[PDB]
Amino acid sequence: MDIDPYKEFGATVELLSFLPSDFFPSVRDLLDTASALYREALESPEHCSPHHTALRQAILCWGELMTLATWVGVNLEDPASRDLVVSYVNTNMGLKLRQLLWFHISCLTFGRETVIEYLVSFGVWIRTPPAYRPPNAPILSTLP
Amino acid sequence: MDIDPYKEFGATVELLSFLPSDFFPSVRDLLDTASALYREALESPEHCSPHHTALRQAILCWGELMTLATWVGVNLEDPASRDLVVSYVNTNMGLKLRQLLWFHISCLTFGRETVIEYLVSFGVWIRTPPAYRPPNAPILSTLP
Amino acid sequence: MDIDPYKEFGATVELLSFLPSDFFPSVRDLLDTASALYREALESPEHCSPHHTALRQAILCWGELMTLATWVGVNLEDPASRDLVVSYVNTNMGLKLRQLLWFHISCLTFGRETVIEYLVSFGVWIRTPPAYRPPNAPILSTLPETTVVR
Amino acid sequence: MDIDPYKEFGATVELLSFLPSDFFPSVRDLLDTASALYREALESPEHCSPHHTALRQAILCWGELMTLATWVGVNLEDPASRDLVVSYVNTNMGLKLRQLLWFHISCLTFGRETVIEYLVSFGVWIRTPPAYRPPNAPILSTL
């Protein structure tokens, strides 16, 4: 099928392409954020939110992928092979999981509408040529 | 983070491993079942149900896994090494995805509670001696 | 001290004396059944029922017996006598444990009264010669004989 | 499963680890006490209490372990072996069984809460260095 994991949440894979690949934090950083803020809800027996559901599934997907790649490397012989293997992973699958984790953790921390408006505004900012681009990029905050 | 993908629905990996691995259908068959029965709701922009959410996420996960496995198989030279990697991915991740897709499809089809009762009943059945159990294996049916 | 582990639950050993050994699932099968159906309640800090209590005690007993028998088979110094050791175990203690675990898991799934009636009827059946009894034993199941769930 | 036989009775294997292993009486003594005090209730057709249930099960388990170890010592030839076997038994399985029997008998006799508090206090006593450790170890008593 051709499923978009975001249009169920009011976005698309092309609205999140407004943000470059350089923008998304590491999976370690995002998993730490989750474990810090929504651990007792992700480990809960409740349908607390579609965002929680999707975050659980994404974490399990990252687990499966890491396990596969690690077993591959451990069973593979050459080191450079392993190196560009994990490079391809971090480039293709890690990026998608980063986008997903960011989207969901931000929709939990700030709000779905807030995050979508942030995406629009950051697209404005990053389309704006640098000569006319302010330095104070848009950012998500519960503060002034 | 010690996440169970089934306890927000009322199940557990212990309750799904309570059935033989040789019971869950092929992931191809399950994906076809989904494409036939709920494609219009999985490709929809609606929180139709947590089952739909998890099903979308699981389909995407399987897609990513297959992409990676195909990539590493193409990279590898030996069909022996390819057999190794495909057998591993099947045995572990394909089995997990089989369990997940079966759970969610069967739930959307028959009922979460019917599926859980079916799990326990089929487990007790397959663990019971044949001379002291009903001879026909249990099965789910929408037909009276 | 002349204790019957079932007299408290309304049964006896003379009532389960009729059930054959081929009737009870393996100990691993029964332990898995318990882990899947009542693990949350057996690992709980509550008195859920005497059946839960006795199930916990029986699982602990089986663990102790397993440790003992494995240590023995290991330190025996002849891989030929471990066969007879495990034979004795699976013939006496494994059988008692299967009996007990089955009784409790069943009195939890179905009712205590249901299980006792099943035992009475199964005794009627197994005491009857094959030439005069029906060929298919009575059945205790959460399913109809057709086994189709809707 | 990770069943704790005392969690439903308000204790744990960490609370009874305070008491040493040389503290618990012999299974003979414990069974004599159990008979004398609660025979007509353990031989009874009643869920008189979960303590009674667990005590019955423990007595049966001990009888079973003894049957097994007896059969093993018989079919074994070397007396050194046989003594090593029964020593292993007395050190692991007999120890756990008499922990359980002590817990449940003492509970039936004095109160589950009395016994929990006794465990805590005995921990205090056994952790107290000997220069300040009273010789009068804590003891369960009604009068």
UniProtKB/Swiss-Prot annotation, chains A, B:
MF term (GO), any: structural molecule activity
Subcellular location as annotated: Virion; Host cytoplasm
PTM section of the record: Phosphorylated by host SRPK1, SRPK2, and maybe protein kinase C or GAPDH. Phosphorylation is critical for pregenomic RNA packaging. Protein kinase C phosphorylation is stimulated by HBx protein and may play a role in transport of the viral genome to the nucleus at the late step during the viral replication cycle.
Keyword annotations: Capsid protein, Cytoplasmic inwards viral transport, DNA-binding, Host cytoplasm, Host-virus interaction, Microtubular inwards viral transport, Phosphoprotein, Repeat, RNA-binding, T=4 icosahedral capsid protein, Viral penetration into host nucleus, Virion, Virus entry into host cell
GO cellular component, one term: host cell cytoplasm
GO biological process, one term: symbiont entry into host cell
Function description: Self assembles to form an icosahedral capsid. Most capsids appear to be large particles with an icosahedral symmetry of T=4 and consist of 240 copies of capsid protein, though a fraction forms smaller T=3 particles consisting of 180 capsid proteins. Entering capsids are transported along microtubules to the nucleus. Phosphorylation of the capsid is thought to induce exposure of nuclear localization signal in the C-terminal portion of the capsid protein that allows binding to the nuclear pore complex via the importin (karyopherin-) alpha and beta.
Entry's family note: Belongs to the orthohepadnavirus core antigen family.
Subunit text: Homodimerizes, then multimerizes. Interacts with cytosol exposed regions of viral L glycoprotein present in the reticulum-to-Golgi compartment. Interacts with human FLNB. Phosphorylated form interacts with host importin alpha; this interaction depends on the exposure of the NLS, which itself depends upon genome maturation and/or phosphorylation of the capsid protein. Interacts with host NUP153.
Annotated protein name in UniProt: Capsid protein
Organism: Hepatitis B virus genotype D subtype ayw (isolate France/Tiollais/1979)
Whole-protein residues included: 1 to 144 of 183
Swiss-Prot record, chain C:
UniProt-annotated location(s): Virion; Host cytoplasm
Gene Ontology, cellular component aspect: host cell; host cell cytoplasm; T=4 icosahedral viral capsid
GO biological process: microtubule-dependent intracellular transport of viral material towards nucleus; symbiont entry into host cell; viral penetration into host nucleus
Keyword Repeat part of the UniProt annotation: yes
Impact reported for residue 80 to I: In strain: Latvia
Keywords: Capsid protein, Cytoplasmic inwards viral transport, DNA-binding, Host cytoplasm, Host-virus interaction, Microtubular inwards viral transport, Phosphoprotein, Repeat, RNA-binding, T=4 icosahedral capsid protein, Viral penetration into host nucleus, Virion, Virus entry into host cell
Major localization class: virion
Keyword DNA-binding included in the entry's annotation: yes
Any one GO molecular function term: RNA binding
PTM remark: Phosphorylated by host SRPK1, SRPK2, and maybe protein kinase C or GAPDH. Phosphorylation is critical for pregenomic RNA packaging. Protein kinase C phosphorylation is stimulated by HBx protein and may play a role in transport of the viral genome to the nucleus at the late step during the viral replication cycle.
Domain of life: Viruses
Subunit structure of this chain's protein: Homodimerizes, then multimerizes. Interacts with cytosol exposed regions of viral L glycoprotein present in the reticulum-to-Golgi compartment. Interacts with human FLNB. Phosphorylated form interacts with host importin alpha; this interaction depends on the exposure of the NLS, which itself depends upon genome maturation and/or phosphorylation of the capsid protein. Interacts with host NUP153.
Similarity field: Belongs to the orthohepadnavirus core antigen family.
Function: Self assembles to form an icosahedral capsid. Most capsids appear to be large particles with an icosahedral symmetry of T=4 and consist of 240 copies of capsid protein, though a fraction forms smaller T=3 particles consisting of 180 capsid proteins. Entering capsids are transported along microtubules to the nucleus. Phosphorylation of the capsid is thought to induce exposure of nuclear localization signal in the C-terminal portion of the capsid protein that allows binding to the nuclear pore complex via the importin (karyopherin-) alpha and beta.
Protein name, as recorded: Capsid protein
Organism: Hepatitis B virus genotype D subtype ayw (isolate France/Tiollais/1979) (HBV-D)
Entire protein: shown range: 1 to 150 of 183
